[PDB]
Amino acid sequence: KLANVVILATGGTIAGAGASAANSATYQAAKVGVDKLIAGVPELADLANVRGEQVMQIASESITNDDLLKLGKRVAELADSNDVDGIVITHGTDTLEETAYFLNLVQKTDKPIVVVGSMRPGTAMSADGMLNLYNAVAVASNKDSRGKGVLVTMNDEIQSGRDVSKSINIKTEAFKSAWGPLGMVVEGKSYWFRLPAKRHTVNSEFDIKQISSLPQVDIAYSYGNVTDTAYKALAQNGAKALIHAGTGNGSVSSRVVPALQQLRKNGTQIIRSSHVNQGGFVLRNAEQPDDKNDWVVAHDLNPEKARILAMVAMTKTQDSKELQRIFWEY
Amino acid sequence: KLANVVILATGGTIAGAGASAANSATYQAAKVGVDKLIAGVPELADLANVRGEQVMQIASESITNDDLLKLGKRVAELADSNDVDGIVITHGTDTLEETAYFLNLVQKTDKPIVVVGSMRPGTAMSADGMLNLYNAVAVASNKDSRGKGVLVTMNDEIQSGRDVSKSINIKTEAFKSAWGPLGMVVEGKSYWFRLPAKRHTVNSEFDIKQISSLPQVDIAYSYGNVTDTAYKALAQNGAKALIHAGTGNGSVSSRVVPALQQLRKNGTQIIRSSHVNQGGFVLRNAEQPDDKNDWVVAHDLNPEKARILAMVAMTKTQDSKELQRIFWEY
Amino acid sequence: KLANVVILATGGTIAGAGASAANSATYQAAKVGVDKLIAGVPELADLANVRGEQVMQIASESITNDDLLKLGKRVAELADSNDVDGIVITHGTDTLEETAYFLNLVQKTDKPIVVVGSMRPGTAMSADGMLNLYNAVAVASNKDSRGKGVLVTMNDEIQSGRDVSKSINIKTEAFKSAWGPLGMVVEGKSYWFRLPAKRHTVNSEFDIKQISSLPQVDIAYSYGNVTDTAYKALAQNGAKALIHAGTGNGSVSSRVVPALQQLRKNGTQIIRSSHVNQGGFVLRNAEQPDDKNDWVVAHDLNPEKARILAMVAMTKTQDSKELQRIFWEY
Amino acid sequence: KLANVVILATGGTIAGAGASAANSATYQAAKVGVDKLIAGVPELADLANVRGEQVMQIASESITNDDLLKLGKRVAELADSNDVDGIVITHGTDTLEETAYFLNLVQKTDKPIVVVGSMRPGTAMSADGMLNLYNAVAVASNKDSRGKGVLVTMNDEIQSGRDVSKSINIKTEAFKSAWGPLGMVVEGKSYWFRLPAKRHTVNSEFDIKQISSLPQVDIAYSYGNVTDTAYKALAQNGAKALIHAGTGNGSVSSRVVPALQQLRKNGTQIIRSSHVNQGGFVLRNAEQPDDKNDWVVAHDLNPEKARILAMVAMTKTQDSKELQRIFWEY
């Protein structure tokens, strides 16, 4: 029969509202509740038996680590339930990529977990939210969606929660991945073209049930004439690990290297990422002697993704060699 | 009757060196001299009369504001000479997009200024440097190249120095612009398909000859659970303007808003940019009341690009409304 | 005051209708008339004084050369009128790129000509048509839109009618150009980032007023084991010129070259294009001796674009050297 | 204990030759031998024990169905030998995507089969061939490469032979897949990010050892004002199946429909593909009643790719429903 799908609403633009129908970029996020959001798509009933639950009502750029745990643990409870077949989470696009990757690492279930949002508020003309939610439920109730990890369904695509990222502003095609979408969803039907190769959900060594609180991890941006100011201030404020958002291949300025070395000697993990996020990856020992300095490379993960993985990995290990191995498998 | 082109060497991967021919990503930059580079491309003579000049031998990620002024002034001197028709600058790829944009804003000349680099060291197999240098001189010696602002010539393309960006790591197609290439360079021939719409070089209200010092501008990255720590730290250490690299449409977490407001009252310019750099732009008054807070929006410019424009702009005005106009015109 | 905008409706998906709101890819095109299409966007009134006119009601893949002339001449009449400031044409996406390029070459006016369509029918949920039409009128009533040539406004972008093409199926971001969009349209405001470099509208040597009928031009596809069968059959059926949709750089199979040579000797113009349409261009004399055989290269234009330019150019010249010059300027 | 890799040379640009070092696009293909190619990359020895074999010396645009069978059978023989671990095939870029897909369908083996080419002749500056060949052997000698189907290694990427396509002319980044790269190859090391979802090699129901002849399949291009001329001509000359390269979602002009129906009754398979090859796919029963007319839809495969699948499929069945299943699984 129909699959049982639960919709966990967290707010965002999909639940936002603007001044008029012409307002597709200027609006107030997290204004509409889950039940009114479900009622806007009557054709949802033909896809599955759907239930709405309001986990929170926020603008995603203002999300906290405790908001993540709250959502993560609620997902884990729903997943354990026999009466729940799939899970759809409505999330603001700003940090959707962070939450999607977090869930991918800590939810040890093969049940479909789909995160969805929209680039235009439901009050705008040609609002992308209705179809995105339809596609979300369509994918969550599909048996073929199992064992694929966390999924993001926007712009008629099925993107991997791991490496999808908000790469384009304003437009509905906002979410892209350097390794392409896994498939597409058209008229309730899912079409797969690729499979993930990185560890996730059921085969992850991490488990949200064991996590009580996440370690503080912060990101410093690198550019011309950059100093160590931001790096030291974040570390002094409690950061257990710093994500270096370097130029090119995770490059570090000669006048910032000393700060990073002493920060490492003082127990802070130094993870090299970059602001070159359309493609490619940061190679270990290429731009900097990571072995010599005992640093970690973030591979292909962008700064915000790298932070998420760092937080999670550190609840299990403070070993840099193991942290490096984790950045190469997840 | 061959044009006179001067090559201004600054280091980078083009003048880099790896341990073997199989080393295309692991190597040491700034190892080769200017006339050694010129000697490797004998065919350069066919295109024009080339003169080499070593301005500096550095890795671009370690560039400083003074290095920018030195290069900017050396370029201005060459531009005023009648014995110079076009100017080529070999520069490390890491911060090439920053320098190229700086020159696009402060060089009051219609003579071609082409910045070029390479993703592979000249010691590697299939090194991309030689052809890149050849195309650079080909474009600099071409009369059709005048009046189009600063250009970057890599991957057989003619990119605008304004918005071209290092978006992909490792690959030779590293540089991309959200608005596309202006043209292409094939077998010494230039092909134009697009023209710049933004103010540059000749019609720029800025001039390197009147610029003696650049104000300190820093960048703070925004993400999930971000605090005002780095923002305040950077401001306390001399930052006259802070480039906010926000999530989505330059969004600011509710927790960082009051700090940004206080730093604004204290005279630090708040420029909202984003880490969504593949397309679109940050819209004024959308995600935040820029009018109420007297903040500036970076339009389509990424963080590092917005930093350069801010620096240059602030040498002429500290009026936020004038600053916004400038970000909308350059 | 408000600009006078005329909407010329030709049918297509924007005027289509599906079985239910879930039907975004399966529908019946050309079902809704222009007046009902205008009435679906009440906010259109705030943008300009709009008038609707039904030129035809067809599915664009079934468009004829006489349908093009009909539309082309009707545009020319509206453009000559002082009571018309801008023109918007609703057209099916399938051959939108053909019509947009045709108008770009034959309408000698600086008035804004905007072609628009949608990827989903107005009956679907999250239909992209309403906003596309709004953006179309917004752009057509903008004084800054003048002298830019023919424009296509879809997916919040402003694309050039010359090289925009339907490159992706199903998705709203269907239209792409190898040289990028000219700008974007967000909330009725137009933002420009690039300018066209190719000849168009007011500076075109072609004029629809002089054209009574277009020459027959056809396209043959090239692949592995291709024979001359299609090339000879099309020519024998009246084709004055054949567009060779070759592999790679307009390459021609060794067993197809003879047919092309004799076809040329018999008065048929041979234009080399390719099915490598994401980027780059076909170089003259590279893959085949175009000078020796007196062939023409289509530069960067795809097969269907190349056909449009061929048809138009031939109403003025049957000279191959001049045809080549035209393919290098338009 | 170095793996044994055989390089099967077939010609192309890698073995091409230009007049000078400045000639990167104008040159003559198939000029260099297999052991001359191997001698140019001495470092190849570090990776594995390599044996060279010249199967043919042709320009890929002039490839025939028999050339495919010859290569396909020579590959099968090498695959069954225990003295062969991986197979590298140097092939002209023009029809590389066709051959690579053919081999992906008919080679019943999990041993690595890597097809490689280059955009610049080895005589040119910054020729891309040497590194491309190095990566090819690096990937073929890697145990991780087994069971992933045919791979193409250019531009530092690991592309799937199924959907990789020559999408950009001139540039080294010529090959692109709508579903993204599977991984990357850097400094002799392979990095995987995605796995194939479609049937290939080992789990393919096809086998080159049981294939003696390939049925003739041709392609007709669709556009504005298209007639049934080429469709009928191709069918009258032996075409057992016609690949319709339609506009949009494989749409067919109302004028060409009756002819396609008559050719179907006569036994010619009608496969609807499109010239919208950057993304998306052709949907069954959307633009045309495929069920009523007993036609087949090519899914996401471009024209030349659909031709190869049709050829191979038709050696096993002429049942249209079975043919549709095959297009949905491979």
Ligand SMILES: *[C@](*)(C=O)CC[C@H](N)C(=O)O
């Ligand atoms: C509109 C786009 O989704 C609202 C975005 C907002 N910053 C959010 O909640 O992420």
Ligand SMILES: *[C@](*)(C=O)CC[C@H](N)C(=O)O
């Ligand atoms: C090679 C990439 O171009 C070396 C880059 C280096 N970090 C630089 O000088 O920017």
Ligand SMILES: *[C@](*)(C=O)CC[C@H](N)C(=O)O
């Ligand atoms: C829907 C997409 O626009 C209908 C497309 C149809 N083939 C047309 O009229 O172009």
Ligand SMILES: *[C@](*)(C=O)CC[C@H](N)C(=O)O
């Ligand atoms: C260079 C591009 O690879 C030569 C291509 C030639 N037409 C071929 O052999 O395919």
